[PDB]
């Protein structure tokens, strides 16, 4: 009998219970006892769900109130002094680190190339590692909970090498290399593992996902060092677990480890199987990650079972486990909550709950149990998807054949374009602009029910546009925005107006802490049926003689912030999105909106995890899909791009050939753009929470020393959606007043 395994379950609750109770706690409506009660209930619910499904190896310690990495920081006493001076209990120290205290919060960081964020482990020279036993030892206590329910679980802990390597030296210790602290942390891991075995844990999932990165040789050697120290008869068996990538470049590092087994991601990298299976020693198990833990597609059982069979061939059926490819943290909780999706489409999907049934069916299948009814129903679902008209749109398929270098190049290089733009706009030196958003629900809500006219709703959006435009005029901004009050979010607003997308009612996935996202789903070939943004931009331009920026989200961001298709490449999807947005750009320009900003916040997030062909191909096609969107315009049309990064690759920025770029900036990297003719707006203040006309005049005089004033735009770090009016007013006034003082001396 081949076992099934789940590497982690999302903890938000099928009804977002966790959000409700954590936010109620943080607001004071709920006690900490009520919060812990709800967490216990959620875990119990999830453990029973997995047991009922038939899952053999069920996780524990996967639950969290905020972040599992943060949970290990707490447990291991990686707690900076600043969070201990407030008389907080252990859980409120946790929340303080996670979300600050109203001390700013520890840094939030993308978890590999997933859409989840963890809280960066933060270490000092003074860090003293030890088991915080005051709180409770979370993994022991939750194992013990599950056991009292009659559920044996496998505790999940992030391993020592990854935990340190993904961490960072605190402000006070800028010279510390986190991985040097390995000898100090190992005893604390060993102790935790002894306690788990004593509680009755026979196996632990020890996550070492840093194995899918490019690791320095000096870091590669630390696996043998760590795992030699931990394994022994007084600890559970350890299953060294990787996901999201290819371990092959690091095989030498793990080829001689004493651990009980390994897990690999054969969804993202099925081709690594032969080689990784080759390092397995007699006695070691191979966990075959074959049900995707980061997307929503029903798994092809025929294909997944074949992969598992390849593994069985290598190491024996006794030593193979059918697993999720990663934790199901990255997927929504339950497809049965969806009430609006057409049943044809819904048939193509599986969310977390359904993935439990999948790993179980695939394990039965390879074990020789009769699951022919389930295989046949699955083969039907797969065939229906691949045959559907939603999936392949001949028009889009033909249009993709027009893509090339030419379609992705402007009519003239920037120097000739600048001449034509200068003639048209005559923008002064140190032109001032902002990034788009300014400081809601009832009219939206009643429009959605038919309680107010299309006519009635358009009036309030327009009044708000008007308010914002007059504001920016009043304070003398040179290139204006409409404020984006009609938009809810920067991806759904587009996806809802594109063919090839589906939307959930309840497909929530945790992004960070209690902030959850409900991504769009790309189901098929994408196209744009009609204008998406034109009406509001035109209105906004009709009420000022200042140039008005059109505002779009780029193709890569729409792709990366959606659940993508798993039957066609990322590239193909981004190019279809580039083509759709090209039509939008063409419509904006035709209608007189000839300054257009395209925002690509998610470019760095999608970067392939290792150096090599895949990474360089990605940078090439990311840039190309942007250029396909933006290259049809006249020379006198001014294309802007905004990036929410401080040190994004200068090379990639040049590849976009945007007339103007805005970059967050509030070291010497401004010099990288010296002999690059296109214009740059280095963000002057953090819109996350007034500077003075002097503080600005010092910041611009600072920058102005390393960069030509003729190329320099003045703007904030990002949109001011997430701010209040009174500080927006004073902050922007100062900003413009500053520019004018420079504008005077040139």
**348 assigned ligand-binding residue:** no
* 3-state SS record for 469-491: HHHHHHCCCCEECCECCCCCCCC
Smallest distance from ligand GLN to CB 658, Å = 14
Q: Which stretch binds ligand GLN (CB under 6 A): 103-111, 267-275, 433-441, 663-671?
A: 433-441
**167 assigned ligand-binding residue:** no
Q: Which is nearer to ligand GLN, 419 or 722 (CB)?
A: 722
Q: Which is nearer to Zn ion, 408 or 718 (CB)?
A: 718
Residue 599 Cα distances to 502, 562, 602, angstroms: 23, 16, 9
Q: Which of 184, 317, 546, 721 binds ligand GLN (CB under 6 A)?
A: 721
Q: Which is nearer to ligand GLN, 393 or 489 (CB)?
A: 489
User: What Rg value do the Cα atoms of the chain yield, rounded?
Assistant: 27
Q: Which stretch binds ligand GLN (CB under 6 A): 172-180, 429-437, 453-461, 581-589?
A: 429-437
**516 assigned ligand-binding residue:** yes
- The string of DSSP letters for 640-663 reads EEEE--SS--HHHHHHH--SEEEE
**645 assigned ligand-binding residue:** no
Binding-site size for Zn ion (CB under 5 A) equals: 2
Q: Which of 312, 663, 718, 732 binds Zn ion (CB under 5 A)?
A: 718
Smallest distance from ligand GLN to CB 697, Å = 24
Chain centroid to Cα 64, Å, comes to: 18
Question: Interhelix angle for 725-744 vs 693-705, to 10°?
Answer: 50
CB of 554 closer than 8 Å to CB of 517: no
Name the closest residue to ligand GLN (Cβ). Answer: 719
Query: Which residue, among 361, 349, 356, has the nearest Cα to 304 in the 3D structure?
Result: 361
In the residue annotation, 679 being an active-site residue is answered as: no
Smallest distance from ligand GLN to CB 441, Å = 18
Smallest distance from Zn ion to CB 435, Å = 6
Q: Which of 39, 261, 436, 495 binds ligand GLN (CB under 6 A)?
A: 436
**292 assigned ligand-binding residue:** no
Q: Which stretch binds ligand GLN (CB under 6 A): 328-336, 368-376, 435-443, 664-672?
A: 435-443
Q: Which is nearer to Zn ion, 161 or 718 (CB)?
A: 718
Q: Which of 642, 652, 679, 723 binds ligand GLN (CB under 6 A)?
A: 642
**640 assigned ligand-binding residue:** no
Q: Which stretch binds ligand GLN (CB under 6 A): 49-57, 215-223, 276-284, 718-726?
A: 718-726
Partner residues linked to 136 by β-bridges: none
**484 assigned ligand-binding residue:** yes
Q: Which stretch binds ligand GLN (CB under 6 A): 12-20, 135-143, 432-440, 691-699?
A: 432-440
**718 assigned ligand-binding residue:** yes
CB of 151 closer than 8 Å to CB of 58: yes
Binding-site size for ligand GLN (CB under 6 A) equals: 11
Pairing of strands 117-119, 108-110: antiparallel
Q: Which is nearer to Zn ion, 575 or 644 (CB)?
A: 644
Smallest distance from ligand GLN to CB 472, Å = 13
Q: How many CA atoms lie within 13 A of 182 on its CB side?
A: 22
Name the closest residue to Zn ion (Cβ). Answer: 718
Residue 321 Cα distances to 204, 245, 265, 666, angstroms: 14, 19, 12, 50
Smallest distance from Zn ion to CB 163, Å = 30
700-709 own/partner pairs: CB under 8 Å, 24+ apart: 700/430, 700/738, 700/739, 700/742, 703/665, 703/670, 704/742, 706/668, 706/670, 706/671, 707/670, 707/671, 707/673, 707/674, 707/680, 707/682, 708/674, 709/429, 709/430, 709/742, 709/746
Contacting residues for 480 by C-beta, under 8 A, at least 6 apart = 433, 434, 469, 472, 473, 540, 544, 546, 547, 548, 549
Q: Which of 62, 67, 357, 599 binds ligand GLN (CB under 6 A)?
A: 599
Residue carrying the six token digits 């990255």: 330
User: Using the rule CB under 5 A, is 644 a contact of Zn ion?
Assistant: yes
User: What is the per-residue burial (b if ≥16 Cβ within 10 Å, else e) of 625-646?
Assistant: bbbbbbbbbebebbbbbbbbbe
Q: After which residues is the chain broken (C to N over 2.5 A)?
A: 102, 439, 666, 689
**644 assigned ligand-binding residue:** yes
Tell me, residue by residue from 534 to 563, as one string, x for binding to ligand GLN by CB under 6 A and - for no binding: -----------------x------------
- The string of DSSP letters for 193-224 reads HHHHHHHT--EEEEE-GGGGS---HHHHTHHH
**512 assigned ligand-binding residue:** yes
Q: Which does 551 bind (CB under 5 to 8 A by kind): ligand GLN, Zn ion, none?
A: ligand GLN
Q: Which of 14, 555, 691, 719 binds ligand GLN (CB under 6 A)?
A: 719
Smallest distance from Zn ion to CB 719, Å = 7
CB of 40 closer than 8 Å to CB of 145: yes
**91 assigned ligand-binding residue:** no
- The string of DSSP letters for 428-466 reads -SS-BB--SB---HHHHHHHTTTSS-HHHHHHHHHHHHH
**457 assigned ligand-binding residue:** no
Chain centroid to Cα 113, Å, comes to: 7
Smallest distance from ligand GLN to CB 481, Å = 7
Element (H, E) at 109: strand 108-110
Q: Which stretch binds Zn ion (CB under 5 A): 100-108, 200-208, 625-633, 638-646?
A: 638-646
* Residue 466 burial by Cβ neighbours in a 10 Å radius (0-12, 13-18, 19+): middle
Binding residues for L-methionine: 435-437, 484, 599
Which stretches of the chain bind ligand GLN, using CB under 6 A? Answer: 435-437, 551, 599, 601, 642, 644, 718-719, 721
Binding residues for Zn(2+): 642, 644, 664, 718
Which stretches of the chain bind Zn ion, using CB under 5 A? Answer: 644, 718
Binding residues for 5-methyltetrahydropteroyltri-L-glutamate: 19, 115, 489, 512, 515-516, 561
Residues with active-site annotation: 688
Binding residues for L-homocysteine: 435-437, 484, 599
Binding residues: 19, 115, 435-437, 484, 489, 512, 515-516, 561, 599, 642, 644, 664, 718
């Amino acid at each position: 009998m081949v076992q099934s395994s789940v590497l982690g379950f999302p903890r938000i609750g099928g009804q977002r219970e966790l959000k409700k109770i954590t936010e109620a706690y943080w607001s004071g409506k709920a006690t900490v006892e009520e919060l812990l009660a709800k967490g216990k209930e959620l875990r119990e619910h999830n453990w029973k769900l997995q047991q009922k499904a038939g899952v053999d190896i069920i996780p524990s310690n996967d639950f969290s109130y905020y972040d599992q990495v943060l949970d290990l920081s707490l447990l291991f006493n990686a707690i900076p002094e600043r969070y201990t001076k407030f008389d907080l209990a252990p859980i409120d120290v946790l929340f303080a680190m996670g979300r600050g205290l109203q001390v700013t919060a520890l840094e939030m960081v993308k978890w590999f190339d997933s859409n989840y964020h963890y809280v960066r482990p933060t270490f000092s020279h003074s860090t003293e590692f030890k088991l915080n036993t005051a709180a409770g030892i979370k993994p022991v206590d939750e194992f013990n909970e599950a056991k009292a329910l009659g559920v044996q679980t496998r505790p999940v802990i992030l391993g020592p090498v990854s935990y340190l390597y993904l961490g960072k030296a605190d402000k006070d210790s800028l010279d510390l290399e986190p991985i040097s602290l390995l000898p100090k942390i190992l005893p604390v891991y060993k102790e935790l593992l002894q306690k788990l075995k004593e509680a009755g844990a026979e196996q632990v999932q020890i996550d070492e996902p840093v194995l899918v990165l490019d690791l320095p040789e000096a870091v590669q050697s630390k696996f043998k060092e760590a795992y030699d120290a931990l394994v022994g008869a007084d600890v559970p068996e350890l299953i060294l677990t990787t996901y999201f990538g290819d371990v092959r470049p690091n095989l030498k590092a793990i080829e001689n480890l004493p651990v009980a087994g390994f897990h690999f991601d054969f969804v993202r990298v099925p081709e690594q199987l032969d080689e990784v299976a080759s390092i397995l020693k007699d006695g070691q198990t191979l966990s075959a990650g074959v049900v995707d833990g980061r997307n929503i597609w029903k798994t092809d059982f025929a294909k997944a079972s074949a992969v598992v069979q390849k593994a069985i061939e290598k190491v024996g059926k006794d030593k193979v486990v059918v697993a999720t490819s990663s934790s199901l943290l990255h997927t929504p909780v339950d497809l049965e909550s969806e009430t609006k999706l057409d049943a044809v489409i819904k048939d193509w999907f599986s969310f977390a709950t359904q993935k439990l049934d999948e790993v179980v069916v695939i394990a039965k299948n390879v074990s020789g149990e009769d699951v022919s009814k389930q295989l046949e129903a699955n083969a039907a679902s797969i065939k229906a998807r691949s045959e559907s008209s939603i999936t392949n749109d001949p028009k889009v398929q033909e249009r993709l054949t027009t893509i090339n270098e030419a379609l992705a190049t402007r009519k003239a290089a920037f120097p000739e374009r600048l001449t034509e733009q200068k003639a048209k706009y005559n923008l002064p030196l140190f032109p001032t602009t902002t990034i788009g958003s300014f400081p809601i629900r009832i009219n939206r809500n009643k429009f959605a029910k038919g309680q107010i006219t299309a006519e009635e709703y358009e009036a309030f959006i327009n009044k708000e546009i008007e308010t914002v435009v007059r504001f920016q005029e009043e304070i003398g901004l040179d290139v204006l925005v409409h404020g984006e009050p009609e938009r809810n979010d920067m991806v759904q607003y587009f996806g809802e107006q594109l063919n090839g997308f589906a939307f959930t009612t309840n497909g929530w996935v945790q992004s960070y802490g209690s902030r959850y996202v409900r991504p769009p789903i790309i189901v098929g070939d994408v196209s744009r049926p009609k204008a998406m943004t034109v009406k509001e931009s035109v209105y906004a331009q009709s009420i000022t003689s200042k140039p008005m920026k059109g505002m779009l989200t780029g193709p890569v961001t729409i792709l990366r912030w959606s659940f993508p298709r798993d039957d066609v490449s990322g590239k193909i999807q981004a190019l279809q999105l580039g083509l759709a947005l090209r039509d939008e750009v063409n419509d904006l320009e035709g209608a007189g909106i000839t300054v257009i900003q395209v925002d690509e916040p998610a470019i760095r997030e999608g970067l392939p995890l290792r150096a090599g062909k895949e990474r360089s191909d990605y940078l090439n096609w990311a840039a190309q899909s942007f250029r396909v969107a933006t290259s049809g315009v006249e020379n006198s049309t001014q294309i802007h791009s905004h990036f929410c990064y401080s040190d994004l690759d200068p090379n990639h920025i040049k590849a976009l050939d945007a007339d103007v770029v805005s970059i967050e900036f509030s070291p010497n990297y401004i010099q990288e753009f010296s002999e690059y003719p296109n214009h740059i707006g280095l963000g002057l203040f953090d819109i996350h929470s007034i500077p003075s006309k002097q503080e600005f005049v010092s910041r611009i005089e600072e920058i102005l020393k390393v960069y030509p004033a003729s190329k320099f735009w003045v703007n904030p770090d990002c949109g001011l959606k997430t701010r209040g009016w009174p500080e927006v007013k004073e902050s922007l006034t100062n900003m413009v007043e500053a520019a004018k003082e420079f504008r005077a001396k040139y």
